[PDB]
Design a protein around this ligand. Structure first.
Ligand code: HEM
Length: 463
């Protein structure tokens, strides 16, 4: 018990604290340089707010222990609603009563498979035209559609809400500087953005109405025909009035759309980019798929458990390119971490990007070497056991779902990299830039452009 904060740099300035030292939009690079001098736990003042920066796994675990836990999720996204929002108590009761469980997420697999197939068919078309495909854009549409279809169904009104949610996400990303809602200003927008906002509430109200009558017709024993797929919202509506309000249902839907869907699109692109840049690993990945699954049917989500190298590839891309390089938490009460005092209300920053590249934990950390997870949650979480990860379609998409998409892509296609003067790069130049774009979520700065090439025995046997 040293009775003092973790060490801090100099100088601390009256109003801005240490903010003048943050001279890099990619904050995690600056936090590493500071960590080299001041150690694995140090204090920065974001204005008047003390902010403690940790960069070891042991420090992360200390911040997750109970005193009430000394740190909590922030409201940067809707995941914080799970422990804190009162209307999420309804979800917790469904879980404890075995009415919402892992089987609920497993039964959505056919919906997830059809969304995967849609992407493969887009790539197949680009293979036939031999035209560059914006894989970044396709992965954003894939994750956005899969979330909305799992939640609400295949109706055309859900296609409309998916396009609207993606547009809202677009307006949410332009208010971002480094972290979201930092350059936001109270303004008037325009008629274009106004129509985007006003479209959401009437569309979701109609979708809930159309799903409520399906639930009622199933409850009263009446037969239903047309769309036999059961959506996640149907499970919520089926027990909403047992013996939760419409507004609170709409609030759950808002939370379901804003928990970080884009993280899966970002991590999928980082993984594909590492595979393109590491032909040895990509060849070995296709050999596993050809051996475990074969060339006669598409990879299925049930195969992922039998694809250890594919799972190691996802872990290895997560180690090098965590979607959130800096994870934020808030101190809930005065506590002591490794002898230092952490004050109530302090912002806590986990530099997970630094840990992923630290030679103290990883042999040759700059190498994309999935074997490190073999020769010795397929991403390799901070929420306690029993928080509901097993019942969440978003966690499924971020793990088994992304692994299935990546395996399906490389099973069917070679990814050619187009060049800047009428040529396809290959093979020493067949690489993509790994430069980062600043953000809370940090994607590749350059969109992933690829010219798919159908592998031999794929068009007729698979697509
Ligand atoms: C119904 C549709 C739902 C959607 C579309 C959705 C969406 C998401 C997404 C996109 C994430 C981010 C996962 C990641 O990238 O790491 C997430 C996280 C999470 N969700 Fe959901 N969710 C849904 C329902 C639920 C439910 C019912 C629960 C019940 C407790 C739940 C609990 C969680 C938890 C605990 C996390 C955090 C997991 C972690 O950080 O490791 N979700 N959700």
């Amino acid at each position: 018990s040293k009775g003092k904060l973790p060490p801090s740099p100099k100088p601390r300035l009256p109003f801005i604290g240490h903010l003048h030292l943050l001279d890099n939009p990619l904050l995690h690079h600056t936090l590493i340089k500071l960590g080299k001098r001041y150690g694995p736990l140090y204090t920065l003042y974001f204005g008047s707010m003390p902010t403690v920066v940790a960069s070891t796994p042991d420090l992360f675990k200390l911040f997750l222990q109970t005193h009430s836990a000394i740190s909590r999720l922030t409201y940067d996204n809707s995941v914080a609603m799970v422990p804190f929002a009162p209307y999420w108590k309804f979800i917790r009761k469904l879980i404890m009563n075995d009415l919402l469980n892992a089987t609920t997420v497993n039964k959505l697999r056919p919906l997830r498979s059809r969304e995967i197939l849609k992407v493969l068919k887009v790539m197949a078309n680009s293979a036939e035209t031999q035209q560059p495909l914006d894989v970044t854009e396709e992965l954003l549409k894939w994750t956005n559609s899969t979330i909305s279809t799992m939640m609400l169904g295949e109706a055309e009104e859900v296609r409309d809400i998916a396009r609207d949610v993606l547009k809202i996400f677009g307006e949410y990303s332009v208010t971002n500087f480094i972290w979201p809602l930092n350059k936001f200003k109270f303004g008037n927008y325009d008629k274009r953005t106004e129509e985007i906002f006003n479209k959401y509430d009437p569309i979701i109200e109609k979708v809930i109405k159309k799903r409520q009558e399906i639930v009622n017709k199933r409850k009263n024993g009446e037969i239903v025909e047309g769309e036999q797929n059961v959506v996640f919202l149907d499970t919520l509506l089926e027990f909403a009035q047992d013996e939760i309000t419409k507004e609170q249902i709409k609030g759950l839907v808002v939370d379901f759309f804003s928990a970080g869907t884009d993280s899966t699109a970002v991590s999928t692109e980082w993984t594909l980019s590492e595979l393109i840049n590491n032909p040895r690993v990509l060849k070995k990945a296709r050999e596993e798929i050809d051996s475990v699954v074969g060339k006669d049917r598409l990879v299925d989500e049930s195969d992922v458990q039998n694809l250890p190298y594919i799972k190691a590839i996802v872990k290895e891309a997560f180690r090098l390119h965590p979607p959130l390089p800096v994870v934020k938490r808030k101190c809930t009460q005065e506590c002591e971490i490794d002898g230092y005092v952490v004050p109530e209300g302090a912002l806590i920053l986990f530099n997970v990007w630094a840990v992923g590249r630290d030679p103290k934990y990883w042999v040759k950390p700059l190498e994309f070497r999935p074997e490190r997870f073999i020769e010795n949650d397929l991403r390799g979480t901070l929420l306690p056991f029993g928080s509901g990860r097993r019942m969440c379609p978003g966690v499924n998409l971020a793990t088994a779902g992304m692994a299935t998409m990546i395996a399906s892509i490389i099973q069917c296609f070679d990814l050619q990299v187009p060049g800047q003067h009428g040529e396809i790069l290959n093979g020493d130049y067949a690489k993509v830039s790994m430069e980062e774009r600043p953000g809370l979520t940090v994607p590749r700065a350059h969109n992933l452009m690829c010219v798919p090439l159908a592998r031999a025995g794929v068009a007729d046997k698979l697509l």
